[PDB]
Amino acid sequence: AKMAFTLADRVTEEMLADKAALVVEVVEENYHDAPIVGIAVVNEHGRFFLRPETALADPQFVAWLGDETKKKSMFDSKRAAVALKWKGIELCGVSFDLLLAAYLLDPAQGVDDVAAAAKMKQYEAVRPDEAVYGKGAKRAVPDEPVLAEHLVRKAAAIWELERPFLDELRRNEQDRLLVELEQPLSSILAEMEFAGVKVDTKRLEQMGKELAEQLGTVEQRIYELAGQEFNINSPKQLGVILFEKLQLPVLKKTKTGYSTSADVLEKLAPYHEIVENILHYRQLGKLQSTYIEGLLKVVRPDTKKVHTIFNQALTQTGRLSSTEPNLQNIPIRLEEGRKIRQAFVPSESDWLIFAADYSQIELRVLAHIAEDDNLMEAFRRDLDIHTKTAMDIFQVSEDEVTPNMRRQAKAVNFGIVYGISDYGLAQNLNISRKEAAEFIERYFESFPGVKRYMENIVQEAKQKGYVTTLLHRRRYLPDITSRNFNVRSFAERMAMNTPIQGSAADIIKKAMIDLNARLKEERLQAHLLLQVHDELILEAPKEEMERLCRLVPEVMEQAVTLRVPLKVDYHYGSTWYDAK
DNA sequence: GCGATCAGCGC
DNA sequence: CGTGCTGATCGC
Ligand SMILES: OC[C@H]1O[C@@](CO)(O[C@H]2O[C@H](CO)[C@@H](O)[C@H](O)[C@H]2O)[C@@H](O)[C@@H]1O
Ligand SMILES: OC[C@H]1O[C@@](CO)(O[C@H]2O[C@H](CO)[C@@H](O)[C@H](O)[C@H]2O)[C@@H](O)[C@@H]1O
Numbered sequence: 303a304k305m306a307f308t309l310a311d312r313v314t315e316e317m318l319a320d321k322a323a324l325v326v327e328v329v330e331e332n333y334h335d336a337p338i339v340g341i342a343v344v345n346e347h348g349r350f351f352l353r354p355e356t357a358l359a360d361p362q363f364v365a366w367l368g369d370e371t372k373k374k375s376m377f378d379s380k381r382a383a384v385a386l387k388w389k390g391i392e393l394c395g396v397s398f399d400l401l402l403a404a405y406l407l408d409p410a411q412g413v414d415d416v417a418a419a420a421k422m423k424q425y426e427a428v429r430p431d432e433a434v435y436g437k438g439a440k441r442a443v444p445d446e447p448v449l450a451e452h453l454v455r456k457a458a459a460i461w462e463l464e465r466p467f468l469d470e471l472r473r474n475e476q477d478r479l480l481v482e483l484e485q486p487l488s489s490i491l492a493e494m495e496f497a498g499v500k501v502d503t504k505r506l507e508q509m510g511k512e513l514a515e516q517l518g519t520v521e522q523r524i525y526e527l528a529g530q531e532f533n534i535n536s537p538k539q540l541g542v543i544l545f546e547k548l549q550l551p552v553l554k555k556t557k558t559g560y561s562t563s564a565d566v567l568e569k570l571a572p573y574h575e576i577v578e579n580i581l582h583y584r585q586l587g588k589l590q591s592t593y594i595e596g597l598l599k600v601v602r603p604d605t606k607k608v609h610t611i612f613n614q615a616l617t618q619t620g621r622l623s624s625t626e627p628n629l630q631n632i633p634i635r636l637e638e639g640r641k642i643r644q645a646f647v648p649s650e651s652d653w654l655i656f657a658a659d660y661s662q663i664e665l666r667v668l669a670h671i672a673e674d675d676n677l678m679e680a681f682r683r684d685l686d687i688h689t690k691t692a693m694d695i696f697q698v699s700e701d702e703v704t705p706n707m708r709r710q711a712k713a714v715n716f717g718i719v720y721g722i723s724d725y726g727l728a729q730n731l732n733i734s735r736k737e738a739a740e741f742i743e744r745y746f747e748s749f750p751g752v753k754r755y756m757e758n759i760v761q762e763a764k765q766k767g768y769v770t771t772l773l774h775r776r777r778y779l780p781d782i783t784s785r786n787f788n789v790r791s792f793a794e795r796m797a798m799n800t801p802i803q804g805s806a807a808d809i810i811k812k813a814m815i816d817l818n819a820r821l822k823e824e825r826l827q828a829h830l831l832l833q834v835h836d837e838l839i840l841e842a843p844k845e846e847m848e849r850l851c852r853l854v855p856e857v858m859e860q861a862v863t864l865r866v867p868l869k870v871d872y873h874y875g876s877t878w879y880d881a882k
Numbered sequence: 883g884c885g886a887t888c889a890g891c892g893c
Numbered sequence: 894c895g896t897g898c899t900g901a902t903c904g905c
């Protein structure tokens with residue numbers, strides 16, 4: 303039966319109590335400068351629905367929203383906070399965010415709406431958002447009666463669920479993680495997203511023109527060498543040309559056909575001149591379609607800024623993700639793509655971009671957690687970790703390490719940092735699974751502490767059912783007991799990797815909170831723009847660079863205290879590209 | 883229109 | 894046989 307509530311035509315005092323579940327509904331997935339379709343408030347006085355036009359124009363309600371002493375419980379408060387920021391309204395006092403609470407309790411559940419979170423506690427008196435709004439082209443805000451009941455039911459669920467969610471977090475020893483880390487970070491992410499990053503669109507357009515030129519040249523060359531025209535961007539069509547018309551060997555196949563991935567094309571290059579051209583085409587095409595045209599599509603015409611959205615409740619490792627646009631994967635490895643970064647500039651005249659990154663934070667975290675004497679000593683001496691790993695696994699002095707040895711040691715470390723299988727390592731180094739496994743073995747012989755940790759963490763995951771990070775983030779691994787070798791092995795690798803990657807996530811998140819506190823104490827105009835897993839990107843007046851060179855690295859390095867030092871490198875320049 | 887498949891970017 | 898995200902193609 304329907305849920306009782308007052309569909310108010312004006313704001314009343316009882317709607318402004320010092321404790322309430324609040325819903326400020328933004329239906330558009332991208333909430334930047336998006337519409338607020340409705341508001342719901344549930345407190346000790348009852349349940350209320352308010353039309354945005356009314357509430358947001360009412361000075362009492364606005365003041366209530368901005369009053370830090372008036373506590374609010376919400377679901378995805380960042381969405382509401384940002385939508386309100388675009389309307390010039392401040393949201394304060396959010397003491398509980400159900401989305402973040404559910405995320406910390408179990409990232410694997412994929413909770414993306416109130417209904418999903420509520421179902422965790424057998425509460426189902428609320429509908430999934432998709433059921434109410436639909437999806438895709440059929441998505442739309444329903445009539446007021448339907449909308450009002452939905453927002454009220456969501457607010458009611460939040461009101462009822464706060465206590466049980468907080469109680470379980472306390473049992474998991476995650477209450478501080480929510481209240482002292484994720485919730486405060488949510489507000490910082492809101493400011494970053496709202497600020498956005500300025501884009502030199504003319505620069506991007508110029509690069510695009512140039513790429514279009516090169517693409518046309520290589521495209522014709524490809525048809526030339528192929529003896530016919532075909533859709534190069536079609537793995538299917540390309541596969542027929544390469545493996546049927548040109549008879550190149552089939553070294554790898556996909557579930558549906560011939561593989562044409564770069565790793566495969568690399569091996570085929572010697573056989574035909576068309577290959578190198580296909581590779582060149584893939585590189586330029588990726589830049590053109592994804593980084594030039596893609597970025598240009600989401601830049602705001604009025605300010606020339608891009609406003610990403612950081613998904614704080616998605617990854618199972620505790621990392622943040624970025625969308626519309628994704629600003630965590632802008633090219634940097636190859637010089638060609640790297641130039642894309644020249645397009646990201648300061649948002650004000652005479653300001654500069656400042657970037658600071660942790661040096662090998664994942665392996666330092668591993669040295670700390672595993673308490674491996676060799677690895678800890680390596681970082682205490684601040685050694686080149688890849689040269690050092692090569693020295694130990696290949697049993698040679700430092701001057702005996704060749705470039706190829708270091709490359710292979712670096713690939714092994716990559717595998718450790720990301721928890722890839724011996725198969726993954728074999729493909730990465732183009733060697734046999736046996737040889738790959740062989741390197742792993744040599745690594746454990748030289749880093750016995752790491753081997754002990756891996757064995758111990760796997761047993762711990764099996765016994766408790768989950769693994770944890772430095773700040774108590776948790777990840778359940780039900781597959782660790784599977785009688786299927788591949789499935790179980792993956793779970794075991796995640797058991798060892800999550801504490802590493804997840805703790806690194808915990809650290810940079812706390813650094814972000816500590817940094818903003820310091821920037822405020824110092825009254826610096828500098829502010830965060832982006833987080834890219836192990837690095838922070840800021841912009842600030844050129845006159846603040848010297849102070850940032852000392853402040854940023856220090857705050858980041860001191861975020862937590864490990865058995866080994868943390869080290870942060872930094873650079874600044876006129877564009878993101880120049881902050882190298 | 884929309885999901886599946888394949889590709890490649892940085893972490 | 895680490896991952897999330899985005900874009901081009903392809904078949905229903
Ligand atoms: O507001 C971000 C927050 O919303 C969720 C759903 O609760 O994701 C939605 O919004 C994202 C940003 O536009 C989209 O990428 C995603 O597809 C959409 O469902 C959460 O996952 C996220 O933390
Ligand atoms: O000129 C466009 C026309 O060419 C084809 C090949 O016959 O595709 C080419 O151009 C596309 C757009 O630039 C690329 O995506 C593709 O990789 C390239 O081969 C046709 O599909 C298209 O109609």
Ligand SMILES: OC[C@H]1O[C@@](CO)(O[C@H]2O[C@H](CO)[C@@H](O)[C@H](O)[C@H]2O)[C@@H](O)[C@@H]1O
Binds near residue numbers: 757760761782790
């Ligand atoms: O030989 C023991 C060694 O094998 C691993 C897998 O690499 O774990 C296996 O053996 C354990 C018993 O000691 C089981 O609990 C586990 O499920 C099974 O895969 C290592 O963790 C262990 O050191």
Ligand SMILES: [Mg+2]
Binds near residue numbers: 659660661662836
């Ligand atoms: Mg780094």
